[PDB]
Each structure stands twice: as C-alpha cells, then as structure tokens.
C-alpha cells in the first residue's frame with residue numbers, strides 16, 4: 204500500500220532524471236559542437252528546452268500531486284504549474300510543425316536541404332513560437348477563461364490543496380484544436396510531402412552513389428588504376444600526373460586531384476551516356492534493355508558500371524528472363540553468381556530492383572534521407588504519445604466521465620514521458636552519437 208509509493212516515487216524520480224539528463228545533453232551538444240549548429244538543430248534546441256522545462260517545472264509536481272494524493276504547493280503555483288504544462292506541450296508541437304515546414308522548403312529548394320532561413324531568422328521564428336504558445340497557454344489560464352461554472356469545480360478552485368484541471372467545454376474544444384490539432388494536422392500533411400519528395404529524388408545517380416560510392420579525391424581502384432567520383436576511370440597509367448591531366452581535361456579546370464560532388468555527378472551522367480550507347484551496340488544486351496522500363500534500365504546500367512558489358516552479357520539465362528518479365532526467376536539466377544557472392548548487399552539491392560521495378564531498395568540509404576526518418580520518428584512518437592490524451596479531451600466534451608480519471612491521468616503521463624525519448628531517438632544520428640560520447644568522456 205505505502206511501500207508502493209516509495210517504489211512509484213523512485214520510478215517517477217528516474218523519469219525526471221531521464222528527461223533532464225538527456226535534454227541537457229542535447230542542448231549542450233548543439234551549443235558546443237559547431238558541426239551540429241544548423242537551423243534544424245536550433246528548432247531541436249527549442250524542442251529540448253520545452254522538454255527540459257517539463258522535466259524540471261511540470262513532471263516533478265505532477266508526480267508529487269499523485270503520490271501525496273493532494274496539492275501542497277498552493278493555488279498560485281497550481282495555476283502557474285498548469286500554465287507551464289500547457290505551454291511546453293503547445294511549443295513542442297508548434298516547433299515540430301515548424302521543422303516540417305522548414306524541411307519541406309529545404310527539400311524542394313534548388314539549393315536543396317539548406318533551409319531558406321538564416322540562423323538569425325530561425326531565432327526569430329523560435330522566439331515567435333514561444334510567444335504564440337504563451338499567448339495561447341498563459342492568457343486563458345491566467346485570465347481564467349478555462350474554468351468551469353459547476354460547484355465541484357468552484358470548490359476545487361477555491362481549495363488550496365485541490366489542483367484538478369476542470370475546464371469549460373468551449374475551452375476544452377477551442378484550446379485543444381488551436382494548441383494541438385491544428386499544428387498536428389499541418390505537420391503530418393507537410394511531412395508526408397517531405398517523404399514523397401525525398402523518395403522522388405531517388406534516381407540512377409543516387410543508386411550508384413549508394414552502391415559504388417562518390418569519391419571527391421583521386422584514388423586507386425581494385426586494379427590499381429587512378430579513378431575518381433563514382434568509379435570514373437581516368438587512365439590506366441601509373442603516373443598520377445597523367446590522371447590529373449585527364450581529370451582537368453574532363454572537368455575543365457586545374458583540380459589538383461580534388462572535385463566537387465556536383466562535378467562527380469557531371470562525369471557520372473557522361474559515363475551513364477556512354478554505358479547506354481554501349482548496351483545498345485551489344486547484340487545480347489540491346490533486346491533486354493529495349494524491353495525494360497526506366498527503373499530496371501538503371502538496374503542494368505548499374506551492373507554494366509560494375510562488371511562491364513561482357514560481364515553482364517554472360518548472364519544469358521537471367522537476361523532472357525528479364526526480357527520476358529519473369530522477374531523472380533531472373534532474381535533466382537542472378538543470386539547464384541560470383542557477383543552476388545562478392546558484393547551481396549549491392550547485388551541484393553539491384554536484384555530486388557529488378558524484382559519490383561521501384562527504387563524501394565534504396566530508401567533510407569542516403570545520410571540525408573536517414574536524417575529525415577529521424578525527424579519523422581520524433582514527430583510520430585510525439586503524436587502517438589499525446590494523441591490518446593487529446594482524443595479524450597474531445598470525447599469528454601461529447602460525453603463527460605466516459606473514461607475513468609485514472610485512465611485520463613495515465614494518458615497524460617504517456618504524454619509527459621515523451622519528453623524523455625527524443626534524446627534517445629537522436630542517437631540514430633552519427634553526429635549526435637559522436638557528440639554525446641565526447642560529452643560523456645568516451
């Protein structure tokens with residue numbers, strides 16, 4: 204009975220420590236490491252502050268209120284505490300929604316992924332998020348617009364040891380729509396469009412960038428030959444200066460061995476052009492290529508990049524099956540090669556691409572697309588943690604008392620606890636993971 208309290212107390216204490224520790228760690232990492240000082244990370248910091256305030260100002264007193272079974276901090280702080288609670292939750296979803304809109308413009312911009320905002324404009328957007336969240340959280344609570352007019356509530360308001368958030372229905376509806384449902388619907392809609400855009404960037408360049416790798420500096424390939432970019436061969440000569448000469452002549456400037464990503468892409472589109480002409484001159488590949496759709500043609504080119512036309516022309520049975528659209532059987536045969544034996548992962552992705560005729564095997568391979576999934580995970584987690592709570596606010600406007608007080612409280616704590624997850628979700632990033640382990644003396 205009572206020993207349960209201590210044990211429940213220690214648990215809630217660890218929840219508070221978890222929220223404060225992890226969010227402190229996120230703030231410190233972005234504030235300390237110049238590498239992590241990006242526009243997105245400024246909004247993340249804003250998100251981390253809302254969760255930090257939840258962990259220090261909201262969760263500790265909510266815990267105490269439950270364990271003591273009464274409010275001991277008085278009416279002033281009950282109303283203040285209540286205001287911070289609503290503020291932090293409102294600012295969180297408003298920020299998440301700003302991240303979605305920012306990522307949408309970043310990913311659709313011709314200067315792709317750079318936010319259209321400067322660091323200073325981002326601070327103003329953040330400041331404006333906290334002002335708007337305050338205007339929508341503190342005003343109604345401090346102006347007493349939220350309060351119900353029935354006696355049980357009136358008693359609780361006057362009662363210094365009672366801190367139950369009894370509200371009128373109009374507030375229950377209006378506040379929950381404006382603070383939560385509006386920015387949630389926008390976030391979800393806009394960030395689903397971010398994924399569609401991200402998916403739509405997948406193409407042969409990205410495919411070979413994932414499968415072969417883009418190298419900005421001259422390197423020796425497996426045969427010892429000087430190569431650059433996505434396996435672009437410069438010369439078979441052992442003279443480096445001979446490679447550099449060919450590189451400069453190809454790129455159109457003094458490179459000194461180093462090229463930009465966009466120049467690697469220029470060379471790659473030429474190599475692709477060359478591969479296709481070669482395929483169309485090869486009696487055994489031409490019929491196959493001719494019959495394939497655009498995505499499977501990228502598959503074939505991918506293989507020609509890796510093994511040359513001859514190597515690929517030797518897949519006589521697989522080529523015939525591909526020509527007939529017998530995809531699974533083609534895949535059975537292709538999986539039985541020295542190719543799949545040597546580069547299984549790459550082969551897996553190309554064969555699967557021959558199976559589906561979509562780019563699905565290349566989803567979330569690129570660091571930037573992985574980063575977009577991380578953000579999507581932050582958003583989805585927040586949604587799943589708070590949605591039940593906010594559904595019950597509206598359900599109680601329709602028919603009150605349908606769901607027990609203890610269930611409603613538990614759904615609120617699922618919301619609270621969410622303030623501890625984002626720091627763990629950021630361990631998906633290699634940059635945060637590196638940042639953290641430095642900060643924790645590893």
Ligand SMILES: CC(C)CCC[C@@H](C)[C@H]1CC[C@H]2[C@@H]3CC=C4C[C@@H](O)CC[C@]4(C)[C@H]3CC[C@]12C
Pocket residue numbers: 219220223224227228231259642643
């Ligand atoms: C009243 C309660 C909530 C206060 C407890 C706050 C705790 C979580 C604080 C107090 C001291 C803090 C640590 C002090 C120093 C460092 C080293 C730093 O480079 C990374 C963060 C880290 C490891 C801090 C993490 C958060 C920390 C442990």
Ligand SMILES: CC(C)CCC[C@@H](C)[C@H]1CC[C@H]2[C@@H]3CC=C4C[C@@H](O)CC[C@]4(C)[C@H]3CC[C@]12C
Pocket residue numbers: 230234248252255256259260
């Ligand atoms: C509001 C009360 C009850 C709880 C304590 C509030 C604390 C957690 C808030 C108030 C002001 C906040 C700071 C405001 C500005 C910055 C600059 C930024 O580059 C790193 C975070 C940092 C340094 C914030 C850390 C958290 C902070 C100190």
Ligand SMILES: CC(C)CCC[C@@H](C)[C@H]1CC[C@H]2[C@@H]3CC=C4C[C@@H](O)CC[C@]4(C)[C@H]3CC[C@]12C
Pocket residue numbers: 245248249252253256260287326329330333
């Ligand atoms: C009334 C009390 C309890 C509410 C707490 C409000 C605090 C936490 C709010 C008010 C203004 C907010 C800051 C406004 C602007 C920035 C700039 C950005 O680069 C980091 C976050 C940061 C620094 C915000 C963090 C949270 C913040 C400090």
Ligand SMILES: OC[C@H]1O[C@H](O[C@H]2[C@H](O)[C@@H](O)[C@H](O)O[C@@H]2CO)[C@H](O)[C@@H](O)[C@@H]1O
Pocket residue numbers: 415424425433434435436437474475477478507508509510511512
């Ligand atoms: O065979 C056509 C392409 O070959 C090179 O790129 C290859 C490279 O030969 C090989 O060592 C490596 O395993 O794969 C890369 C591409 O994945 C050429 O220099 C390309 O320009 C040719 O199109």
Ligand SMILES: CC(C)NC[C@H](O)COc1cccc2[nH]c3ccccc3c12
Pocket residue numbers: 265285288289290292293368370374375378379382383596615618
């Ligand atoms: C213990 C209680 C006070 N906790 C409040 C929730 O954590 C967060 O609640 C909200 C956040 C944002 C907007 C909101 N509108 C509401 C209407 C009724 C109840 C809560 C909210 C609410």
Ligand SMILES: *C(=O)CCCCCCCCCCCCCCC
Pocket residue numbers: 641642643644
């Ligand atoms: C390496 O970077 C990690 C070493 C940092 C250790 C710092 C020691 C912190 C002491 C914690 C005590 C504060 C507890 C406050 C409770 C209210």
